[PDB]
Amino acid sequence: DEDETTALVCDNGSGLVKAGFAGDDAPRAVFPSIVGRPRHQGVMVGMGQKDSYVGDEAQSKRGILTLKYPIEHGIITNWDDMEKIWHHTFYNELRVAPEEHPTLLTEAPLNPKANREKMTQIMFETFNVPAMYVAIQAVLSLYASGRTTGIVLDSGDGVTHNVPIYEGYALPHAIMRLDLAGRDLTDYLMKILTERGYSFVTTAEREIVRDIKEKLCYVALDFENEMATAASSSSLEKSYELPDGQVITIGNERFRCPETLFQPSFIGMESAGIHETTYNSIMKCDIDIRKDLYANNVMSGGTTMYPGIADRMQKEITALAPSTMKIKIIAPPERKYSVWIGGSILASLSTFQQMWITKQEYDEAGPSIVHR
Amino acid sequence: DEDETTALVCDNGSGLVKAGFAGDDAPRAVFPSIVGRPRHQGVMVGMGQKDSYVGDEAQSKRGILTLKYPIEHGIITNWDDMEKIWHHTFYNELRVAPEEHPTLLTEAPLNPKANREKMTQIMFETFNVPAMYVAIQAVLSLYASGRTTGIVLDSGDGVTHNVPIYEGYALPHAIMRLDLAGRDLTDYLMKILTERGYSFVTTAEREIVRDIKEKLCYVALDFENEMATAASSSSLEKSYELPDGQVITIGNERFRCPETLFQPSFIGMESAGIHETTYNSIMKCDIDIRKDLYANNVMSGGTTMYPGIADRMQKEITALAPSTMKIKIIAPPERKYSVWIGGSILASLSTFQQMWITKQEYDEAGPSIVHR
Amino acid sequence: EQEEYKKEGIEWEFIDFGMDLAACIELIEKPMGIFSILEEECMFPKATDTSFKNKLYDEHLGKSNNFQKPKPAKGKAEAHFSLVHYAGTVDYNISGWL
């Protein structure tokens, strides 16, 4: 129990932090990855002067603060502001003292060696956690779907990745990163919806375009004769009621937004798209392992939640793969937390105890120890 | 019937195993002589963890296993991996229980005494066969062409041999071995075909160069004015359609590949070639037997199947042999299984029963008994 | 014991008798020990008894003395791993464990 209860799992994202206790089924804490700094001197009624704001209080009060994102494209870019988000996570969100909890953290696919050593330096030397561990994100997603070999298409708020994993070892030279994700996708909907003849003028109009994207957006299979369908004008249309009455209608654009993930050309991107990239990762891997990867395309991440994403991907890679092959696109329902759940499982596991980096290992080996 | 039905014939090669029941006209089982060992831990869907793979499942799954060849140049080099190929042959390929079937096996030309005793030790002591027998390969090939004196040019996947046989006794001191065969020959075609301006890049490109060699390769007679012919560019060319559309053309190289068997110099080999070697075997034999050997050059083996091999050899040795001599190059159509068929005949024969080494002979005389 | 030799005044030095067993215990209860490897694999949605087994070996075999590969014959029924407990060698079958 000492640490059975006690292991923490913190998944640091570009848009959201997911956090909680190893053992739980889902994150106890989910909140924006921002750190707000007040543009002016003054106070809220009853509070003192605050130097900084994190998560939702930074989002809610955004009009008087300069908002900053510590993690650009999955990589920690500002370490002063990240130590601020961690502090908030332990002390306010989970309300635990960190110096008696083992902490499993996550990093990104080709996270620079030096960063994995730096967050270890900050975990052990400024938070004084007993022990910690850094798992790679795609690797926890795979594992949370039971398996050990497969290829994960991972897509969240600032990055998309393909991480081919074989008997647990993520394959460095076959990993692909595509910098277009849910953030890019909300801003494109924004324009095709203002372009539908609308105005997201106040900040209460801006924010909810993102809630339109999440609730009403679709990834149609045969996106071709779906536009064609749009035109005959079926009961395909969908009206959403705004903060007030102002019933906005979205028929068609509803799927023009996730067609951006297959066609980056919709947004002036010259890069290849999700399905081709799944494939290219795969023809960059060893030959003998390619049947395995093809029958185990595990999807994880908030942006892979658009319904019919899996069917489109299913047919997208069948028709690029040699017919002798078995294609299989696994997309679980909890996928917006796969990464986290994979960490919860792993860290609560009976056999993981012997991989925890302890302060004994650290004080004796330097940050190098956990770096592997 | 007890054993009329019941005799097994297993011909162990460097590239292929040929197996089946004495009595049949051709091998019931033909498959690669490999044993694959998985490079990583994991499973196929629905199967358990497999420690090892043999034959075609090792070839098909080669990307995740380390492939190994038990028979190097016709001689068994790894006995752990050979007992694995035998096990597979009896139990999976022929699906028989070995402990009630007499087994005729084959060995190579100057197979070390100690090996013939070792495979007997493994046949009787780990497979518990009722009785067994080891025939020499060239000797079964000859016999399958009806005769008892002749010289066999035997050529398969890893070795070429010349085994002069007189009234059944293969002549030890006149046997020649040339380590260049069909394996060497596929890799040379490979280069003269990439050198034609091509790329056998993926493993589905590699494998089929071998199917090009088998289907389209030729041994031209007057290989001299065949290159000359190539240049005037007749309708000598030949295009093969790859796994996909990619129609590859092979005009000329088509015969430059089997000209390697007469000119080893094409491949940085300093050894003499097939025809000279036929001859040298012959001027190493007794004088009085040389007219016999010359009128009975029996060919066997997968690599002697190249059309026009016999005509080239016909003229190759006429023009080296004294004119008072009769040359005669027998090359039957079933020659890729001569060896096996000779065993099927012999072992189903009415008079062979009294040469079977029985467990009675063995338990009483030690491995020495069958060694002769 | 040591109290007597202290009470009497005898001069006898000796090491804790427990110590002899610490070897076996660590192998079981310590972090990269049996249980752990056992309880980790339980987190792998697609692990096998066989999987577990290998993990057990790769990590303890040859490196650990109390750890051994079985003696499959005698009155025993199959093979997986023996341990060297104070009472003796126990041949353990890992099947269903996961």
UniProtKB/Swiss-Prot annotation, chains A, B:
Q: Does the keyword Acetylation apply?
A: yes
User: Which UniProt keyword terms apply here?
Assistant: Acetylation, ADP-ribosylation, ATP-binding, Cytoplasm, Cytoskeleton, Hydrolase, Methylation, Muscle protein, Nucleotide-binding, Oxidation
Where does the UniProt annotation place the signal sequence?
A: none
Q: What class of enzyme is it?
A: hydrolase
Q: Drop me one GO molecular function for this one.
A: calcium ion binding
Q: What is its EC number?
A: 3.6.4.-
Which of the residues bear the PTM N-acetylaspartate? 1
Q: Which residues carry this modification: N6-methyllysine?
A: 84
What PTM annotation applies here? Oxidation of Met-44 and Met-47 by MICALs (MICAL1, MICAL2 or MICAL3) to form methionine sulfoxide promotes actin filament depolymerization. MICAL1 and MICAL2 produce the (R)-S-oxide form. The (R)-S-oxide form is reverted by MSRB1 and MSRB2, which promotes actin repolymerization. Can be mono-ADP-ribosylated on Arg-177 by SpvB of Salmonella spp. This modification blocks subsequent polymerization and leads to cell death.
One Gene Ontology term of the biological-process aspect is: skeletal muscle fiber development
InterPro entries xref list: Actin, Actin/actin-like_CS, Actin_CS, ATPase_NBD
Any remaining note in the record? In vertebrates 3 main groups of actin isoforms, alpha, beta and gamma have been identified. The alpha actins are found in muscle tissues and are a major constituent of the contractile apparatus. The beta and gamma actins coexist in most cell types as components of the cytoskeleton and as mediators of internal cell motility.
This protein's name: Actin, alpha skeletal muscle
Curated annotation (Swiss-Prot), chain C:
- Spell out the subcellular localization from the entry: Cytoplasm, Myofibril
Organism domain of life: Eukaryota
**Residue positions of the PTM N6,N6,N6-trimethyllysine?**
53
UniProt similarity note: Belongs to the TRAFAC class myosin-kinesin ATPase superfamily. Myosin family.
Q: What is known of its domains?
A: The rodlike tail sequence is highly repetitive, showing cycles of a 28-residue repeat pattern composed of 4 heptapeptides, characteristic for alpha-helical coiled coils. Limited proteolysis of myosin heavy chain produces 1 light meromyosin (LMM) and 1 heavy meromyosin (HMM). HMM can be further cleaved into 2 globular subfragments (S1) and 1 rod-shaped subfragment (S2).
Quaternary assembly: Muscle myosin is a hexameric protein that consists of 2 heavy chain subunits (MHC), 2 alkali light chain subunits (MLC) and 2 regulatory light chain subunits (MLC-2).
Question: What's this chain's function?
Answer: Muscle contraction. Myosin is a protein that binds to F-actin and has ATPase activity that is activated by F-actin.
Q: What is this protein called?
A: Myosin heavy chain, skeletal muscle, adult
Counting on the full-length protein, the chain here runs from 500 to 597 of 1939
